[PDB]
């Protein structure tokens, strides 16, 4: 069960880590929302779709940096919305295909009434999300952790 990033980095069987550099909106005025889409970046595929079927769940979603202070929001997984930082195990998703299928994780971050200025710093850690894969084949548990950085500063208009 190998997962890849749109850039080209890959996490082999067993798990590991992979930094993901996502492009956030240049400016997110208060009262509006900021969408960090990861289905366009993180992809996964089943190694042996014929006989096994993997189960993928978002174990943990943690916020870091200017997201933690200024941007408290939600996470959308397979059409279901949950708090962020996450507080519960998301439901499973079936992977039975040799083709690369996305990981439907979408962060929805909204600015709090704080002015913020430079809410998010370019190159800083803005999220950490944990994928868990346990197969219906044997006693299995792998963790795939993705560190989501921000390429551009997400300035919140003051007025």
């Amino acid at each position: 069960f190998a997962c890849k990033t749109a850039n080209g980095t890959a996490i082999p069987i067993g798990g590991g880590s992979a930094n993901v550099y996502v492009n956030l909106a240049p400016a997110v005025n208060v009262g509006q929302n900021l969408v960090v889409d990861l289905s366009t970046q993180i992809f996964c595929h089943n190694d042996y779709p014929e006989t096994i079927t993997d189960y993928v769940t978002l174990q943990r979603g943690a916020a870091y940096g200017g997201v933690l202070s200024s941007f408290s929001g939600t996470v959308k997984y397979n059409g279901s919305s949950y708090p962020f930082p996450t507080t519960s195990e998301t439901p499973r998703v079936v992977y039975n295909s040799r083709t690369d299928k996305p990981w439907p994780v979408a962060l929805y971050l909204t600015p709090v009434s704080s002015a913020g200025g430079v809410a998010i710093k370019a190159g800083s850690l803005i999220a950490v999300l944990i994928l868990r894969q346990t197969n219906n084949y044997n006693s299995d548990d792998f963790q795939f952790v993705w560190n989501i950085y921000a390429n551009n500063d997400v300035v919140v208009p003051t007025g």
Partner: antibody
Amino acid sequence: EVQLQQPGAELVRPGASVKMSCKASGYTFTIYNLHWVKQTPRQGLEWIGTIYPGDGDTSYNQKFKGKATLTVDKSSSTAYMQLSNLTSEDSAVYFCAREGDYGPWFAYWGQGTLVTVSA
Amino acid sequence: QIVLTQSPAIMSASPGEKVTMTCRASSSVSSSYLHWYQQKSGASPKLWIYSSSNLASGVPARFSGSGSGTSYSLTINSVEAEDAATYYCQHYGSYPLTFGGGTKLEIKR
């Protein structure tokens, strides 16, 4: 299983620095945030700061800022606190803790390093 | 910053009665980010209630957290001798954090 072992005590001369330790066992070290906290008979538990071992991201409370520097080694699965310009009001029991496996709650703690400032 | 004020800070519960411990917040807080920890004196705090309603692993089913928004509280139904400790509330998810005060339950024989 999962343990966050701290050294028992730490005696430090005033006006100098002391470094504690927090060894984490039973899980992938560079996967969860390690937090530090202090406890006194005075005002309640004060959150010292955070560290994410997988990236080195640290963040301090707002007031143990020139006194706390959280660094990890990632090789022997340890987290380190060094206390700068340590005075007599910084004598307390320090806990290192970790978030839960499925949420931001202070799941597993440590025994606590009981730092006393004296000569 | 959002501060936490634990109201009683001192209680006295008979070995068979109820008790309630409020933890007021300075401003409204998402109910999924308040957690109650129990620290018996001379020991390390242990998770007792998370998301303000759920019960941690191993905790007796007497404790029942409730409350939302600003006045999250706690309830011990059949107060036993082993619930004499200090209970703290923490709001994690804003960044400043808080461990406001503490309530030291005392069991009265």
